[PDB]
Subunit: 139 residues, 2 copies
């Protein structure tokens, strides 16, 4: 895939994340992996992502994305982003950082695969709160 069509996909993925979109630029068979592998989280399908994202958006306001580093390997059709996010939530201020590994599809115009390492120390505080929120409200 041409470096410039990949770069377009990369830019639209970032703009979609900052807009709070994300999934317009992902192919239909895209998967998301939570790193590290030791965390033992199964891949998320596209269908999974479309259910989780409304819950997140519904809980996070003033969502802000700060891009720290973008590394693009056009010959391999791969990229990495390091980003920092913040938002307001009913559980308090939310802060996270992401090293997101991206693979583009054959043509270069879609994200085919995602692997993402989060701020694990923040997540072990935040993520069970979300699961509690869903259980208490029975979704």
């Amino acid at each position: 895939a041409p470096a410039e069509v990949q770069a377009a996909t990369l830019e639209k993925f970032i703009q979609g994340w900052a807009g709070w979109g994300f999934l317009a630029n992902a192919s239909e068979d895209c998967t998301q992996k939570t790193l590290p592998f030791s965390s033992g989280v199964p891949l998320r399908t596209r269908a999974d992502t479309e259910k989780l994202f409304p819950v997140l958006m519904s809980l996070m306001s003033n969502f802000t994305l700060d891009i720290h580093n973008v590394v693009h390997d056009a010959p391999q059709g791969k990229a990495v982003i390091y980003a920092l996010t913040k938002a307001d939530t009913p559980f308090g201020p939310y802060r996270n950082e992401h090293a997101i590994f991206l693979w583009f599809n054959e043509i270069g115009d879609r994200v085919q695969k995602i692997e993402e390492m989060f701020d694990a120390v923040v997540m072990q505080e935040f993520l069970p709160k979300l699961d509690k929120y869903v259980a208490d409200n029975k979704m």
Copy 2:
């Protein structure tokens, strides 16, 4: 820097890491940052790294590196490695995973800056054991693991 020069430095960095000989591929002014920024770890100078690394090596036997993903952006002089590691230590078995961001120098023959996120949950047990180790043995490195 030419892509070929950068790629050579990259493979040498990996080889020297897996060989557990490693600082030879780092510039004299190289820094290492532990990510996330939220963890509040000050940057490590090359001198810090030269004191910490022998200590690490000496507590880590049968070290094993598995390269999961290499991403090389030659136009920007940058690369990223996702890797998993294994070792035996007197504190028990060691397991870690690393998203390591690299910047090459101008010529391309050296790594100039390192930013590294790792298995933060597993390491908040392990790295304080190392710092207690150094304290208990009065090794006074002027540097900490966490």
